[PDB]
Amino acid sequence: GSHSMRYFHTSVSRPGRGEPRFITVGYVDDTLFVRFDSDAASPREEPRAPWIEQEGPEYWDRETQICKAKAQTDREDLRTLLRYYNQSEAGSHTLQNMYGCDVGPDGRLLRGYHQHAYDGKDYIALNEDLSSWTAADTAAQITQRKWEAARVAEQLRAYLEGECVEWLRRYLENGKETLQRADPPKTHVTHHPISDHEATLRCWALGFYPAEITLTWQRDGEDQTQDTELVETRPAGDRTFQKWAAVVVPSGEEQRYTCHVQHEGLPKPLTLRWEP
Amino acid sequence: RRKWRRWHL
Amino acid sequence: MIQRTPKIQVYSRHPAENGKSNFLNCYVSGFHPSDIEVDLLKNGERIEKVEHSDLSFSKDWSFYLLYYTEFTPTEKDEYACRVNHVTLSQPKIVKWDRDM
């Protein structure tokens, strides 16, 4: 179907404890494939998936070069942001940046992304047009003016429409055995008596990939949205993910409840009941 | 593959 | 400056079967700032050499990390995850429940 590549970047200042820590990771869909940490003994872009390991020394050198330069730029940017917000040099601050691309089944750009946050809040973002900017406040407007002057959007558009898509397609082919394999969830319902009057029904989805999934409980065919406890999808640590949905049901009424499972790894959405 | 950043905030 | 308190889940990689080797996971998410301390505990004591993922973040910019270690669940042994973050007045302990 559709696929994504994302690069995430976080710099965190720590005055009195050296330079801001820089950590960046790259993903294709929900698969981590590269990482760089400025606190590593010998900081370099490192492989994190089998299919990227085949890339040659030139690849790893260029990626490492880019990471080191980004860490430097982030540190200058953090200093700039202190000025823009009239802030002290004493405090710790956070600068985040994500960029990347989505491709469709035809393999052409579906959407491009490039956005920044300072201290957990949206700062500036490249719009979906890949030509204009949304600035969150008067500080970010200064950045917008600079980036409009330097035609930054045009440079990002060229990358997002070109190399981003082209290299994403390369990775999808090289990692096809895993990146293009959907693992359906293993599913079951468990029963956990709470009292004489009520029991929890917990619907499980285990060992699935990619992370996207829908788990819903119905009572008499009515969606139990307000009454369902849904945990955040969580990593198992083996590439796969886990999730559960739970409802509290009156004892004896368990058969009025059905769990519904949707995942791209399944031909048809599943319907599950508790089986005593 | 990454984009080389050539701009500042 | 925003502050978001971590969501915490403690769970095993595989269904828990007493005496069989497994992985104990603590997934911390939805938090800001990124400075966080996470211990995995066996019967109250800190497990050594616990590994963790590289810092990443969600669409809303909040951070997530996975901390993990090999363990062998038994009937008696208690496992837990202990988390400290600037949003917490004291460290939060979440006990491992094989049913969650």
Side-chain angles (χ1 to χ4, degrees), chain A residues 83-123:
Chain A
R83 294 200 308 280
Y84 288 1
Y85 289 105
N86 308 301
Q87 295 173 327
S88 176
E89 301 178 335
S92 174
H93 297 278
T94 309
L95 177 56
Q96 297 163 270
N97 168 241
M98 174 279 274
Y99 70 82
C101 53
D102 299 343
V103 298
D106 66 321
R108 295 187 89 108
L109 184 72
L110 270 179
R111 185 168 177 161
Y113 306 82
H114 180 278
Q115 50 205 234
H116 280 80
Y118 183 56
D119 286 334
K121 302 206 296 198
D122 291 276
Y123 181 75

Side-chain angles (χ1 to χ4, degrees), chain A residues 3-11 22-29 33 70 74 77 94-102 109 111-118 120-128 130 133-134 147 152 156-157 159-160 164 168, chain B residues 1-3 7 9, chain C residues 32 55-64:
Chain A
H3 299 275
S4 70
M5 182 162 72
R6 298 285 191 273
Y7 289 102
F8 302 93
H9 313 78
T10 307
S11 290
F22 174 72
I23 300 160
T24 177
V25 288
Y27 283 83
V28 169
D29 305 321
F33 78 102
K70 176 69 181 179
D74 266 14
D77 292 342
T94 309
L95 177 56
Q96 297 163 270
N97 168 241
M98 174 279 274
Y99 70 82
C101 53
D102 299 343
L109 184 72
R111 185 168 177 161
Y113 306 82
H114 180 278
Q115 50 205 234
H116 280 80
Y118 183 56
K121 302 206 296 198
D122 291 276
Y123 181 75
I124 200 183
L126 182 64
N127 292 325
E128 191 173 6
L130 312 180
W133 300 97
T134 298
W147 284 4
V152 169
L156 286 164
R157 182 185 158 184
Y159 164 81
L160 292 165
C164 190
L168 176 54
Chain B
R1 156 143 151 168
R2 297 175 180 267
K3 169 97 195 86
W7 42 85
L9 295 186
Chain C
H32 225 291
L55 189 67
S56 189
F57 55 86
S58 312
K59 289 161 72 265
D60 69 354
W61 305 106
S62 69
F63 296 100
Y64 62 84

Side-chain angles (χ1 to χ4, degrees), chain A residues 41-245:
Chain A
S42 172
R44 277 196 66 91
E45 184 92 297
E46 299 187 357
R48 285 298 185 265
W51 44 264
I52 200 72
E53 283 175 32
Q54 59 179 275
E55 301 292 345
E58 298 78 17
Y59 178 91
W60 296 108
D61 288 342
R62 179 198 188 262
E63 287 282 293
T64 294
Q65 237 173 340
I66 290 165
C67 286
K68 288 185 183 191
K70 176 69 181 179
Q72 292 186 110
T73 304
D74 266 14
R75 290 158 188 192
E76 190 174 310
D77 292 342
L78 281 164
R79 291 190 285 271
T80 297
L81 292 157
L82 293 182
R83 294 200 308 280
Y84 288 1
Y85 289 105
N86 308 301
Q87 295 173 327
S88 176
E89 301 178 335
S92 174
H93 297 278
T94 309
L95 177 56
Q96 297 163 270
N97 168 241
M98 174 279 274
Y99 70 82
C101 53
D102 299 343
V103 298
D106 66 321
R108 295 187 89 108
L109 184 72
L110 270 179
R111 185 168 177 161
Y113 306 82
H114 180 278
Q115 50 205 234
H116 280 80
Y118 183 56
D119 286 334
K121 302 206 296 198
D122 291 276
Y123 181 75
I124 200 183
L126 182 64
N127 292 325
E128 191 173 6
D129 57 18
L130 312 180
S131 45
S132 67
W133 300 97
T134 298
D137 57 31
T138 54
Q141 289 168 19
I142 307 310
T143 301
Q144 179 174 350
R145 294 172 204 163
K146 292 210 271 193
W147 284 4
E148 284 166 342
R151 295 213 175 265
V152 169
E154 282 84 354
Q155 300 177 58
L156 286 164
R157 182 185 158 184
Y159 164 81
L160 292 165
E161 287 191 318
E163 269 173 49
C164 190
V165 162
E166 281 157 21
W167 285 79
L168 176 54
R169 288 180 299 199
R170 177 197 180 103
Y171 304 146
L172 292 162
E173 175 66 21
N174 293 346
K176 64 185 174 194
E177 164 188 304
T178 50
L179 299 175
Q180 299 190 64
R181 184 184 85 240
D183 301 318
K186 296 155 190 178
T187 62
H188 69 290
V189 175
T190 57
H191 183 265
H192 311 279
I194 298 164
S195 69
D196 285 357
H197 327 290
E198 291 182 314
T200 297
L201 292 179
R202 184 164 286 117
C203 184
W204 292 83
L206 297 168
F208 59 91
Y209 180 96
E212 172 61 27
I213 194 165
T214 306
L215 291 184
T216 55
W217 278 106
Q218 288 179 9
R219 171 199 168 98
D220 298 337
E222 226 65 54
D223 276 2
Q224 295 300 287
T225 317
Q226 287 271 196
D227 300 278
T228 300
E229 197 195 349
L230 194 67
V231 296
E232 174 180 12
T233 302
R234 69 203 189 186
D238 57 9
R239 108 170 188 115
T240 78
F241 297 92
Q242 307 176 351
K243 195 180 188 73
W244 61 252

